[PDB]
């Protein structure tokens, strides 16, 4: 991989707290990451342990075990409306109560539930490794509808979490197509192709802004689609499995070779590229106090200025390394290392 660049920090980022969460995910590549809601962090490990932690000091509020298989906890954590949602590779979806971690409900779904659960319109959206998109009722977990998506012969481990807008879910497929489905009854609305060198997963979360859907497939392309019809407005030959950011009139992405880039929202023209972290296996990016932040497999956080793609800081945080997505919300920056340790980072 690319060696570590020498950076003179413009500020000194530090760790506000860290808290272990069992043994994390280790080398099992998956989505599992922390959630934050009302000053509580919810985080899990693959084996089945789930904790709620005070967001200010990382001290434990409750801790439960969903094993007592291992559970193979994998998709999530997502929190909404008093519920903590987690999908597993034993094809289970759990809804835990935020107050005490009791299981409100648990549902057997169609396949390994790899995706970050997405909550919208009273439903919980789950995307399985065998190509099913399912909507579960928030109140009892009953499956309301299922959409079959075509699976190629080989794909990339992971499943697209849909975005939602105007009563539709917009989801990436493993065969290079983006699909829009009505959330009332899972009615297919439109499907548009945007795609080992034949690998073409849209594992990224689509982003919907001003009647436009932005989606990104592995091996290309980054495409803008008309939300109403699915028609392609423009495309850029860029590829990734990492979520990207649309903020202001900018697109920020980390491509499949770990180039970090900023593009214009109107046409996807590149503003800058930062290639120094090439093949260090970056997490997807997050905006924190003005800056782009990514983690790498060696356990560094890199802070990047959005105007010019310049490093403003770097910090050595965790030896087991990073993989799953960082989270920035309510004044916090959170990230979970492969060994399960959750960090709250302060700028």
């Amino acid at each position: 991989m690319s060696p570590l660049p020498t950076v003179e920090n413009q500020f000194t980022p530090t760790t506000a707290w860290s808290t272990s969460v069992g043994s994390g995910i280790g080398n099992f590549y998956s989505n599992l990451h922390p959630a934050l809601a009302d000053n509580v962090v919810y985080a899990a490990d693959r084996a089945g342990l789930v904790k709620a932690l005070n967001a200010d000091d990382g001290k434990e509020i409750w801790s439960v075990s969903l094993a007592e298989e291992p559970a193979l906890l994998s998709g999530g954590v997502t929190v909404s409306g008093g519920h903590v949602y987690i999908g597993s590779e034993k094809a289970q979806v759990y809804a835990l109560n935020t107050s005490d971690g009791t299981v409100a409900w648990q549902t057997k779904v169609a396949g390994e539930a790899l995706s970050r659960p997405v909550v919208s319109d009273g439903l919980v959206l789950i995307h399985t490794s065998n190509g099913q998109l399912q909507a579960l009722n928030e109140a009892d977990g009953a499956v309301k509808w299922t959409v079959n998506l075509d699976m190629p012969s080989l794909s990339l481990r992971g499943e697209s979490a849909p975005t939602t807008a105007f009563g539709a879910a917009v989801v990436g497929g493993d065969n290079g197509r983006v699909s829009a489905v009505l959330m009332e009854q899972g009615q297919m609305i439109w499907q548009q192709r945007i795609s080992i060198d034949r690998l073409s997963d849209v594992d990224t979360t689509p982003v919907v802004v001003n009647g436009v859907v932005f989606a990104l497939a592995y091996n290309g392309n980054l495409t803008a689609l008309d939300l109403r019809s699915g028609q392609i407005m423009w495309k850029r030959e860029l590829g990734s499995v990492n979520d990207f950011i649309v903020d202001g009139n900018r697109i920020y992405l980390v491509d499949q070779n770990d180039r970090v880039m900023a593009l214009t929202i109107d046409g996807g023209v590149t503003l800058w590229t930062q290639s120094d972290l090439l093949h260090r296996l970056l997490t997807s990016p997050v905006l924190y106090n003005g800056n782009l932040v990514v983690g790498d497999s060696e356990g560094y956080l890199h802070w990047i200025n959005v105007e010019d793609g310049r490093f403003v800081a770097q910090q050595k945080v965790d030896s087991s390394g990073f993989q799953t997505e960082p989270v920035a919300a309510d004044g916090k920056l959170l990230i979970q290392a492969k060994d399960g340790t959750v960090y709250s980072i302060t700028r």
């Binding site: 080398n27 099992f28 590549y29 193979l72 590779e89 034993k90 094809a91 396949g111 390994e112 490794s129 065998n130 699976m151 012969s153 080989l154 794909s155 990339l156 481990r157 992971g158 080992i196 690998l199 592995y218 499995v241 499949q256 296996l281």
Partner: protein, 174 residues
């Protein structure tokens, strides 16, 4: 790239661990075999699916089905995931065996090869060996290439299977 996990979904009668223990593909090399690796091969996967199929068929699960399988690569291209999605169904008992076709006048001996223990579970391998017994029996009268096909007639109400076996003795050879 090396196999990170071989996962089975839908297996309630037997643990994932017990099932994949019988596979050529490995997500883990056991200490007692040195030669083994975690490399993926298409042909091995195909063999393992047949092993899994036979595992259930031999144990009464006449409706056993492999709904789908996924193979996927991790984005760093170093890891492989294998997932097998199955519907077990219930266990089935053997009601009878009916034999028909060109039996070359050895119906009686053949019928005594297709006897059923009372209350016997369907066993896929036992069906194959019964077919083989019929082929060898015909082989002892000159018929060097007999063909035998067994079609399970499944009764989901009774939880019973009737075997309809077709035999074609074929040419006699000197």
């Amino acid at each position: 790239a090396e196999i990170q996990q071989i996962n089975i979904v839908g297996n309630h009668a037997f643990t994932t661990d017990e099932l994949i223990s019988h596979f050529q593909l490995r997500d883990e090399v056991p200490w007692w075999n040195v030669v083994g690796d975690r490399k993926y091969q298409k042909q091995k996967l195909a063999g393992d699916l047949e092993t899994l199929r036979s595992y259930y068929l031999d144990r009464g699960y006449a409706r056993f089905n492999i709904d789908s399988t996924q193979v996927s690569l991790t984005p760093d291209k170093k890891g492989i995931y294998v997932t097998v999605n199955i519907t077990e169904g219930d266990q089935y008992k053997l009601s009878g065996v009916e034999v028909s076709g060109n039996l070359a006048g050895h119906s009686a001996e053949i019928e005594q090869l297709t006897k059923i223990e009372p209350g016997e579970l369907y066993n896929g391998t036992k069906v194959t060996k019964m077919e083989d017994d019929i082929k060898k029996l015909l082989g002892r009268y000159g018929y060097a290439y007999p063909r035998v096909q067994s079609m399970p007639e499944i009764n989901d109400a009774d939880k019973t299977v009737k075997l309809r076996v077709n035999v074609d003795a074929g040419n006699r050879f000197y």
